[PDB]
Each structure stands twice: as C-alpha cells, then as structure tokens.
Design a protein around this ligand. Structure first.
Ligand SMILES: CCCCCCCCCO[C@@H]1O[C@H](CO)[C@@H](O)[C@H](O)[C@H]1O
Ligand SMILES: CCCCCCCCCO[C@@H]1O[C@H](CO)[C@@H](O)[C@H](O)[C@H]1O
Ligand SMILES: CCCCCCCCCO[C@@H]1O[C@H](CO)[C@@H](O)[C@H](O)[C@H]1O
Length: 433
C-alpha cells in the first residue's frame, strides 16, 4: 500500500538526523582522546560541526542538477552510498594520528556525508505533500519529520549503552578505549543504512529560463512575495538557535552542572551522556508529538507564534541566569526550550514551506526555503564555540533570544495553511482576475 513509502522516507530522516546530531556525542570523546588537557580548538570544533550542514546545501543543489538533468532514476541510490562511504572513512581515522589532523580528517568526511544527507532531504517532503491533497497532510508530514527526534534520541541512547558497556574496562585503566567508543557511535548508523540500501533496490536552458520567468512573475506580487519572504525568514531564523544549540548541546550542558572537577573518565562521559539523554527524552522528542496531535487542530501559525515566543522566554532565562543560578532550574529551562523548538517553530517551518506554495513553483519555493534554513544552521554552527570564547555563553544566548523574537515578528507574513489547497487558491486567485 501507500504506507510503506512514507516509512521509507521516515527511515531516511532518521538516518540523516542520527548522522547529523551524533557529532554532539562524538566531540567530547574526541576531546578526551586527542585533547585531554585543553578543549577542542574552537574554530576546528565549529568547522567539524558545521561540516555536515555545509555539505547538506551542496548536496541538494548538486543532486538537484543531476536529478533534473537526467531524472529521478539517476539519484535514488547514489545518495545513500555516499553517506555510507563517508561514514566508513570518518569511522576509520588512523588512531596514531595527530589531534588536529584527526579533526581535519573528520570534518572533510562529514562534508561528503553532508552532500549525501543533502540528497533525499527535500524529496521526502514533496512526495506526500503532492500525494495527500487532504487536510491530513500535516499530520503526515509531521509524522515523517518526527524521525529527527528519534535520530537524536537513539544517538543518545546508543551513547549511554556504549559507555556503560565500557564501564569496567575504563575503570580498570584502559582509558584509550574511548577512542573505540566514538567510532562505534558513528558506525552503528551503518546497520539501517545498509538495510535501506538493499530495500531501495529490492532545451535544458530554454526550459529553465521559462520556469524562471513564471517564478519571477509569481513572487513579484506582494501577497505572493511575503509568503516566500516569511517562509525563508522563519526557517532561517529558527535554524540559527536550533542547530547552534543541538550541535553543541554537550557544550551547554557543561556550563550547567553536568561537567565538573570531581570523578574519573567514566564518571565524566557517563553523567554528560546522562544529561544529554534527559534533555532529548523529556523535551526534544515529545515536542514533535505535541505538534503532531495539534497542527490540524490549532493551525500552523499559532504553533509558530507560540514556538518562537516560548523558546525565546527560556533562552532569555538561560541568558540571564546561567552564570547565577543552580543546575536544576537551568536544566529544566533548557529542556523546556528544546520542547518548544519541536513543539513549535522547528517543525512548523518545515510544514509551512511544503504547504504554502502551489505545485507549479513548489519545487523552487520549498528548495529556497530549505536552503535559507541551512544558511542559518551554518552561521551558528560555524561560529558558536568561537563566540562562546570571545563574548561568553550568556551573550550568545541573548543573540539566540533576539532571533526568536524576529522569528515571532516574521511569522505575521504567513498565511495559515491548515485545511487549504494551495493549488485551488492559486486557481481562484486567477479565475478572479
Ligand atoms: C565518501 C567521500 C570520502 C571522502 C574522504 C576524503 C578524506 C580527505 C582526506 O583528507 C586529507 O588527509 C589529511 C587530513 O588530515 C590532509 O593531508 C589533507 O589536507 C586532506 O585533504
Ligand atoms: C572502502 C574503504 C574502507 C577502508 C577501511 C580500512 C580500515 C583500515 C583499519 O583502519 C584502522 O581503524 C582503527 C580503528 O578502527 C585504527 O586504530 C587504525 O589507526 C586504523 O588504521
Ligand atoms: C515595513 C514593514 C511592514 C510589513 C508589514 C507586515 C506585512 C503584513 C502582511 O499582511 C498580511 O495580510 C493578509 C491578508 O491579505 C493576511 O492573511 C496575512 O496574515 C498578513 O500577514
């Protein structure tokens, strides 16, 4: 039936999300091995974490040209082997290498990993926004998207299971085995990746200039232009805070009480992994499901308004209190923030970009919005740990706060898409003039 295809798109998101966010769990292990006394150098850590998102935009433009030039049959398999191969190179950095060289190895691998993650990313959204043509398209897009939560959660679960498996060996003095742990964290993605590879198998300028002419004509009208403006702005603005925080969740949990001077190597990695699992289990993950049950009841806009403005509050509390109040209150607010990312702006920007636009131009408008998002992701990703050193963590969280208020403001540019057919509205718009 139609069901099996949406699951396959789901496992595509799951694998993309796992590979993206697992770097947050891998980085503190790389620190313990290759930079035990100092931290990972700020610029190198930022480059390593932005790498996958940088490749992600290169992927969907490149796999876009090839997919348009020679059709969908050209791309469907090749994107997945690229992330499999990129996973294996990343997994197998020479252990006898110098720390900066190991880091540079992983960043480059993660760019190519990103290029593949850039493959199926918008194509899993289109297949069911085109297919459904029903009020329950939002509940469907949201169900596919929720696999981003499971990607981050399973990575955290994999991490505590892995560390607690190495418990006795680390306690008995074999401290280099954390170099084997971080390879297992990346490597375990290969199990669904190979599973899915097998399941997936078992006048060009004249046309482009004609589509460009329709696109420009469409988005040169205000009530049509602002919907593209608001779609680009909302996705751009939320990804600054969202990927800034989530690619560095282990870093924030370290000003909060979860990193300390007490305890040994196991005690360190294990409470830090304990902090990560709490946040994603209690906040990051359930937010997707609160959205799932309410988008086709409350509407998309009311959920972004709430999402931006609620995550703003907890960012302001973090920014104001992080250096001044105890662990507990901060851990709660940080979890509340994560909850209202996914019960809110992060989930709705994705749906709104897929739902706003009539099909005759939907491909570009969704692509331009997704590209705008990745731009916001790479700014914070490229600079988060550098700013944290130049201006401090509280000052960065004040920046994230401001982007949430701008997101709230920009959401007024959008039409509510709950229950609307964008092709019909385009249709009456035209029969009306
Ligand atoms: C599926 C795609 C696979 C991509 C894997 C390519 C890894 C690139 C290897 O990096 C190279 O090795 C050293 C890194 O420390 C440096 O000598 C050199 O500057 C750098 O270019
Ligand atoms: C399709 C190309 C795939 C090539 C994979 C070759 C892997 C060779 C083994 O690598 C080794 O991995 C160990 C940790 O796992 C490190 O201790 C060691 O330094 C490194 O040499
Ligand atoms: C100098 C900055 C000024 C920009 C002003 C904000 C633009 C608001 C656009 O109004 C729009 O009118 C539509 C009805 O036609 C509503 O459906 C939609 O919700 C609403 O967003």
């Amino acid at each position: 039936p139609q069901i099996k295809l949406v699951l396959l798109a789901g496992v595509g998101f799951f694998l993309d999300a796992y590979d993206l966010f697992i770097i947050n769990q891998v980085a503190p292990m790389l620190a313990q091995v290759y930079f035990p006394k100092t931290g990972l150098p700020a610029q190198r850590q930022d480059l390593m974490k932005a790498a996958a998102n940088i490749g992600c935009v290169v992927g969907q433009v490149m796999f876009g040209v090839l997919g348009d030039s020679f059709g969908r049959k050209f791309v469907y398999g090749k994107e997945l082997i690229l992330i499999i191969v990129a996973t294996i190179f990343q997994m197998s950095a020479p252990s006898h290498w110098d720390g900066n060289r190991v880091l540079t190895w992983i960043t480059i691998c993660r760019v190519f990993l990103g290029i593949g993650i850039g493959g199926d990313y918008p194509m899993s959204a289109t297949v069911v926004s085109d297919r459904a043509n029903i009020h329950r398209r939002g509940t469907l897009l949201c169900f596919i998207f929720a696999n981003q939560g499971w990607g981050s959660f399973v990575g955290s679960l994999v991490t505590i299971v892995t560390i607690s498996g190495f418990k006795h060996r680390l306690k008995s003095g074999h401290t280099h085995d954390v170099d084997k742990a971080w390879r297992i964290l990346i490597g375990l993605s290969l199990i669904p990746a190979f599973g899915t590879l097998y399941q997936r198998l078992t006048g060009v300028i004249a046309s482009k200039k004609a589509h460009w002419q329709e696109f420009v004509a469409y988005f040169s009208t205000w009530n049509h232009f602002r919907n593209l403006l608001g779609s680009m702005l909302g996705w751009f603005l939320v990804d600054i805070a969202f990927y800034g925080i989530n690619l560095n969740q282990s870093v924030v949990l370290a000003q909060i009480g979860f990193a300390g001077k007490t305890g040994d190597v196991y005690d360190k990695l294990f409470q830090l992994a304990t902090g990560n699992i709490i946040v994603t289990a209690l906040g990051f993950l359930p937010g997707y499901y609160f959205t799932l049950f309410l988008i086709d009841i409350v509407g998309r806009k009311k959920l972004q308004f709430m999402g931006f403005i609620m995550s703003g509050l907890f960012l302001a509390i973090l920014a104001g209190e992080i250096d001044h109040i105890g662990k507990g209150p901060l851990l709660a607010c940080f979890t509340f923030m994560q909850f209202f990312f996914n019960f809110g702006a992060n989930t709705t920007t994705f749906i709104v970009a897929a739902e706003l636009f009539p099909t005759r131009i939907r491909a570009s408008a969704h692509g331009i919005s997704a590209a705008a998002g990745k731009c916001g992701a790479i700014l914070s990703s490229l600079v988060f740990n550098q700013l944290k050193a130049k201006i401090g963590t509280s000052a960065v969280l004040w920046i994230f706060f401001s982007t949430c208020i701008l997101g709230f403001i920009s959401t007024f540019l959008i039409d509510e898409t709950m229950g609307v057919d964008p092709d019909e509205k385009d249709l009456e718009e035209r029969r009306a003039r």
